[PDB]
């Protein structure tokens with residue numbers, strides 16, 4: 001089915017080390033990223049963010065009393081040519097809203113959508129990712 005061109009990005013990082021959790025995509029194994037996901041019909045961006053965090057890295061934010069922060073930033077970017085097939089005909093732009101999630105410590109991650117995970121210092125995570133928006137979010141909200 002078609003992916004929706006409205007998405008969320010959740011930058012996950014550990015408060016004590018400031019390392020950033022990066023996840024290896026299955027459709028593009030060269031693409032490491034923070035948690036991203038489409039906003040589905042009838043849900044809000046924060047709902048989608050909490051849902052994708054539960055689905056993709058098995059972290060439940062309500063139960064753990066963690067705090068999902070809305071970064072109050074939205075960007076729009078061109079969908080990678082090789083991934084665009086997943087969107088409806090004529091759709092080439094994706095609009096992405098940013099969130100930040102601070103864990104108290106690095107931890108062991110069980111993932112579902114990805115091939116592997118790594119904890120990296122923020123500059124390295126930032127340089128590693130293929131997504132300019134993911135990079136920018138790490139730079140502005142982890143590094144400062």
Ligand SMILES: [Co+2]
Nearest residue numbers: 035036037113
């Ligand atoms: Co995703």
Ligand SMILES: [Co+2]
Nearest residue numbers: 036037038052
């Ligand atoms: Co999704």
Ligand SMILES: [Co+2]
Nearest residue numbers: 036037052113
């Ligand atoms: Co997902």
Ligand SMILES: [Co+2]
Nearest residue numbers: 036037038113
């Ligand atoms: Co999905």
